[PDB]
Amino acid sequence: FRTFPGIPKWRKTHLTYRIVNYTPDLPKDAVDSAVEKALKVWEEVTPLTFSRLYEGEADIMISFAVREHGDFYPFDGPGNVLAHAYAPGPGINGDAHFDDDEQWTKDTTGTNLFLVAAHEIGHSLGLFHSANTEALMYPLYHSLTDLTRFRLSQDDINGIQSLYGPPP
Numbered sequence: 001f002r003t004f005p006g007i008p009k010w011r012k013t014h015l016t017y018r019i020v021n022y023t024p025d026l027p028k029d030a031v032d033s034a035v036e037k038a039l040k041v042w043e044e045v046t047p048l049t050f051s052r053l054y055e056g057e058a059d060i061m062i063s064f065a066v067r068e069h070g071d072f073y074p075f076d077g078p079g080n081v082l083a084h085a086y087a088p089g090p091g092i093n094g095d096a097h098f099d100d101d102e103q104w105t106k107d108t109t110g111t112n113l114f115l116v117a118a119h120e121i122g123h124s125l126g127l128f129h130s131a132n133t134e135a136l137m138y139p140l141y142h143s144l145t146d147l148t149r150f151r152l153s154q155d156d157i158n159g160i161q162s163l164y165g166p167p168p
C-alpha cells in the first residue's frame with residue numbers, strides 16, 4: 001500500500017455523499033447497488049458512515065465528464081484514465097469526475113463498474129497505488145473473469161487499520 005504526499009484522510013466518522021449523474025451504458029439500480037458496496041467499504045473498515053444526497057454540498061460528490069468541463073486535467077476518451085478520481089481535502093479534493101470513459105457493465109464482458117467504483121472511491125478516501133495486483137489499488141485495470149474471487153487483500157486491511165483505527 002501507498003498514500004498521497006502528506007497523508008490526506010477524512011477527520012469525521014459518519015459520512016455524507018451526493019450522486020452527480022447516471023451513465024447511458026447502465027440502468028439506475030446497478031450504479032446505486034455498488035455505490036452502496038464502496039460506502040459500506042468504508043463502514044466495514046472502521047465505523048465510516050454515509051448519508052445519500054441529490055442536492056447541496058458534501059465533499060464526496062461521486063462524478064463525471066464527457067471529454068471536458070473546466071478545471072485542470074483533459075480526457076483521452078477510450079482506454080487508460082478512469083477519472084480524475086479526487087482525494088481528501090477542500091472542494092476539488094474529495095469527489096469524482098469520469099471521462100465519457102468505458103462501456104459500463106455489471107459483469108467483466110464490457111467494463112466492470114464494481115472494480116472501478118471501489119478503486120476510484122478508494123482514491124477519493126486516502127489510499128494511492130499499491131504494487132501487488134490482487135490488492136485492488138493497482139495502476140492498471142486487468143480482467144477478473146470470475147467476479148466471486150474479488151476480495152480485499154491483507155496489505156490494504158493492515159494499512160487502514162493503522163490509518164483510521166480498527167472496527168468496534
Ligand SMILES: CNC(=O)[C@H](Cc1ccccc1)NC(=O)Nc1nnc(S)s1
Pocket residue numbers: 004073081082083084085086087093123139
Ligand atoms: C487529487 N490527488 C492526487 O494525488 C491525484 C491527482 C491526479 C488525477 C488524475 C490523474 C493524475 C493525477 N489523484 C489521483 O491519482 N487520482 C487518480 N485517478 N485515476 C487514477 S488511475 S489515479
Ligand SMILES: [Ca+2]
Pocket residue numbers: 076077078079080081082099100101102
Ligand atoms: Ca478512458
Ligand SMILES: [Ca+2]
Pocket residue numbers: 059060086087090091092093094095096
Ligand atoms: Ca473533490
Ligand SMILES: [Ca+2]
Pocket residue numbers: 023025100101102103104
Ligand atoms: Ca461511456
Ligand SMILES: [Zn+2]
Pocket residue numbers: 069071072084097
Ligand atoms: Zn473535475
Ligand SMILES: [Zn+2]
Pocket residue numbers: 119123138139
Ligand atoms: Zn488508479
